[PDB]
């Protein structure tokens, strides 16, 4: 049965059980240590609602779906064969009521269990889009389709640490040092360099670099990070875990392949992963043998607890904090700073911090906050029980959340110092619980697995076990989807190497056909959408852009005979850009899009679905009924103020339709202009920004990010709300209107997004502290509501004042 095995590692794109790159077995004792926490997961899960698994919600239903609900009654369609009968309900009705299994027409989607249909997502999609809900009345499906295969005290040590340089050796290449750090967190415990030597093919030292810190003294998670200068410039780092995954002191010889750099926080940094490029990389060679407080200074320390996560701690600060350790307690807010003003490097200190963890009723008792607890999951904190409190707080999330953060928790596996953390153990439980939350931890982990050489192994790790536990069906499933991206992702590669077009639109369509009657399933779920299935290719309709990518425009028929519309699936594939920006900024904007919804504030943001799936490659939803607005004004001119307002004309065919486009452009256009500002990608040429034929603007091709402007405003767009250089309409007064509503709603959760934001940077921008800090200028951090609103406002204006200048800057240049 060891073709199980064969099959997971085409499944994972990496082979878990290697050992070739590997110097001790951490990676094998996770692969036992996560049969446990799957089996739990796997034995308590509900059979029936894991086979359907109903897409739900426990958020109130916002003001703007409300106002749009015919007094207490909403109508549901209902099909058996030829039937298409319509009844009335109310939305506290539970799918049991409105019966008199209700499987979503088209789609792989439920609406059963224990809700009412007002919170069931594909409802409030319905009311949203001002759409019907048609159901069919199907049969459970088999619960048995989801079958699972059947499966001397180091306290007692004074004496010093030391480490011995042997040397380093690089087959290919002034001096050179190696400078060796004792690290926790992003924090420098202890430092030592060798003397500088002659850059030869091998430099050998044979010395011993003896530290300050004691054995005793060296806390868990602490990394010896070796790096070698030149002159003087930073070109290799390596880091090895000084306590292992048994808390045993590392001990004995060691040869080590290096990373380079070039291609400063950035999450690589942090990797005690090896190089397994052994034949061109640099190594090193070394050997280990071993009353209660009074007024003025509580409002220091509120003052200090009060203050953004990038705000620095002096040591000042820090001293105030840990000495008043038991009053900062008392305040969730202060837990991030607070665990920052320990001394990690002093075990009676980290034996103090560790019973202050044993008294942490009023963080168990606090409500969830995201923002506080993915700040102490990130770069700056390395001990696991610090990390451990911020996992117990996602536990509450309910699974509508869970998608929300999913991303971002993956990403932030990258600040484990284990491969075996309670995060990893979080997002494995959390998957194996639910489908729609275990398909996007597949592909969010597979994209990674096929990119990351930093990170693959512990990824693969975690998706094997997730692979273990999802279930026959899901398996098959995640085979089909596979093997699809890989025959069209070759046909992707290959047209482009052909390099607008003629032989090649030859060549495509034939290369389409050919996979079409020979390689290509009956069908397959959409990766970005996975309640959609794909069918076979509309040949006729697939093409190639006049570009310098030259990405492919695919569409698909649909594969589910009960769909009431003709529309096709239709989506991009591209080779080119780094799609790992595109998926963090996109998700950020549905996280934005969530806050605007707790407000109820909707902006219509269009965050269409990608996922990359390899080295600079992957996916992109096709937004139907959507052109560009250069495009828009390539048509009518060969810049003009007007070509945008009567393109949205010619496109709706009654004056109701009309008006609905121009408003619900306000809207967009608000939505984007605060979202990109703050993300600080507002200028853009505008053959990157599209609108549908019913009006939503939207921004597209982010994984690219002179005079300047902080966001695209222009007088086409403008002249949609009714403005001409120097006036102000009623849309116009609207868009000001929501777009300071908007702002002012982000910026009630700046700590969230700052830490979003850093995290996005660290892990998926290759950073410096000064672009870090762009958000808290964004977000006018310690600045007032009035005062914010005259900086946003401000920023309108900056564009008005600059009508075309970029937008023509951009067109010469590009
Ligand atoms: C720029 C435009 N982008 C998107 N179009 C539709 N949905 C999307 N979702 C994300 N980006 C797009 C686009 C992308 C293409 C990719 C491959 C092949 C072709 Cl022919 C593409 N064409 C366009 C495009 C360009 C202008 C107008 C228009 F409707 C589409």
Excluded at 604 to 629: H, N, R
Aim: net charge neutral; charged share 25%; with cysteine.
């Amino acid at each position: 049965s060891q073709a199980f095995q064969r099959q997971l590692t085409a499944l994972i794109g990496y082979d878990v059980t290697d050992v070739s790159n590997v110097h001790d077995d951490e990676l094998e004792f996770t692969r036992r240590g996560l049969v446990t926490p799957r089996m739990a997961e796997v034995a308590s899960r509900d059979p029936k609602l894991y086979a359907m698994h109903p897409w739900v919600t426990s958020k109130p239903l916002p003001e703007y779906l409300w106002k749009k609900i015919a007094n207490n009654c909403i109508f549901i369609v209902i099909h058996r064969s030829t039937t298409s009968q319509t009844i009335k309900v109310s939305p506290d009705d539970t799918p049991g009521a409105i019966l008199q299994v209700l499987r979503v027409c088209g789609r792989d989607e439920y609406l059963v269990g224990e809700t009412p249909i007002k919170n069931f997502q594909w409802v409030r999609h319905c009311l949203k889009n001002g759409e019907e809900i048609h159901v069919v009345l199907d049969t459970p499906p088999d619960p048995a389709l989801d079958e699972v295969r059947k499966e001397v005290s180091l306290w007692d040590c004074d004496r010093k640490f030391r480490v011995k340089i042997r040397g380093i050796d690089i087959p290919v290449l002034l001096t050179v040092f190696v400078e060796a750090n004792i690290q926790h967190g992003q924090q420098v415990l202890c430092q030592r360099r060798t003397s500088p030597k002659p850059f030869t093919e091998e430099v050998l030292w044979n010395v011993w670099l003896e530290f300050s810190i004691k054995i005793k003294d060296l806390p868990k998670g602490a990394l010896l990070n070796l790096q070698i200068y030149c002159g003087v410039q930073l070109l290799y780092y390596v880091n090895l875990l000084l306590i292992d995954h048994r808390f045993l002191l590392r001990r004995g010889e060691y040869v080590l392949h290096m990373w380079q750099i070039s291609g400063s926080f950035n999450a690589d940094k942090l990797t005690s992963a090896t190089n397994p490029d052994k034949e061109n990389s640099m190594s090193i060679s070394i050997l280990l043998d071993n009353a209660e407080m009074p007024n003025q200074l509580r409002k220091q320390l509120e003052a200090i607890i009060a203050t953004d996560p990038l705000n620095p701690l002096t040591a000042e600060d820090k001293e105030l904090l840990w000495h008043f350790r038991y009053e900062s307690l008392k305040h969730p807010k202060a837990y991030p700073k607070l665990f920052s003003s320990v001394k990690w490097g002093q075990q009676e200190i980290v034996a103090k911090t560790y019973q202050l963890l044993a008294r942490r009723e009023v963080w168990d008792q606090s409500a969830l906050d995201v923002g506080l607890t993915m700040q102490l999951l990130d770069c700056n904190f390395s001990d696991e029980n610090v990390r451990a409190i911020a996992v117990q707080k996602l536990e509450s999330l309910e699974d509508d959340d869970v998608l929300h953060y999913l991303l971002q928790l993956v990403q932030a596996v990258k600040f484990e110092p284990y491969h075996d953390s309670a995060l990893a153990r979080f997002l494995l439980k959390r998957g194996l619980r639910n489908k729609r939350i275990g398909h996007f931890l597949f592909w969010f982990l597979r994209s990674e697995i096929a990119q990351s050489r930093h990170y693959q192994q512990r990824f693969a790790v975690i998706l094997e076990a997730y692979l273990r536990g999802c279930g026959t069906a899901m398996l098959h499933d995640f085979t089909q989807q596979v093997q699809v991206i890989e025959m069209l992702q070759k046909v992707t590669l290959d047209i482009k190497s052909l390099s607008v077009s003629s032989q090649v639109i030859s060549q495509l369509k034939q290369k389409l056909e050919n996979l079409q009657n020979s390689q290509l399933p009956e069908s397959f779920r959409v990766p970005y959408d996975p309640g959609l299935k794909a069918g076979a290719l509309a040949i006729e309709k697939c093409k190639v852009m006049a570009s310098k990518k030259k990405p492919l425009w695919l569409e698909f028929k649909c594969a589910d005979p009960t769909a009431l519309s003709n529309e096709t699936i239709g989506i991009i594939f591209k080779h080119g850009d780094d799609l790992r920006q595109d998926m963090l900024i996109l998700q950020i904007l549905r996280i934005m899009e969530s806050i605007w919804e707790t407000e109820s504030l909707d902006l219509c943001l269009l965050p269409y679905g990608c996922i990359s799936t390899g080295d600079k490659i992957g996916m992109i939803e096709i937004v139907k009924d959507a052109t560009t607005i250069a495009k828009i004004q390539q048509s009518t001119v060969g810049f003009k103020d007007e070509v945008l307002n009567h393109w949205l004309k010619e496109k709706s065919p009654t004056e109701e339709k009309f008006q609905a486009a121009v408003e619900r452009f306000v809207y967009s256009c608000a939505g984007y202009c605060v979202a990109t500002f703050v993300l600080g990608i507002g200028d853009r040429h505008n053959d990157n920004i599209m609108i549908t034929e019913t009006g939503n603007l939207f921004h597209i091709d982010f994984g690219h990010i002179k005079e300047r402007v902080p966001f695209v405003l222009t007088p086409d767009f403008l002249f949609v709300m009714g403005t001409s250089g120097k006036k102000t309409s009623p849309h116009f007064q609207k868009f000001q209107d929501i777009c300071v509503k908007a702002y002012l709603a982000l910026r009630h959760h700046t700590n969230l997004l700052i830490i979003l934001f850093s995290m996005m940077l660290m892990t998926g921008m290759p950073t410096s502290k000064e672009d870090i800090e762009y958000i808290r200028d964004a977000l006018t951090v310690g600045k007032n509501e009035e005062d914010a609103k005259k900086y946003f406002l401000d920023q309108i204006e900056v564009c008005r004042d600059k009508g075309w200048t970029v937008q023509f800057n951009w067109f010469l240049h590009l």
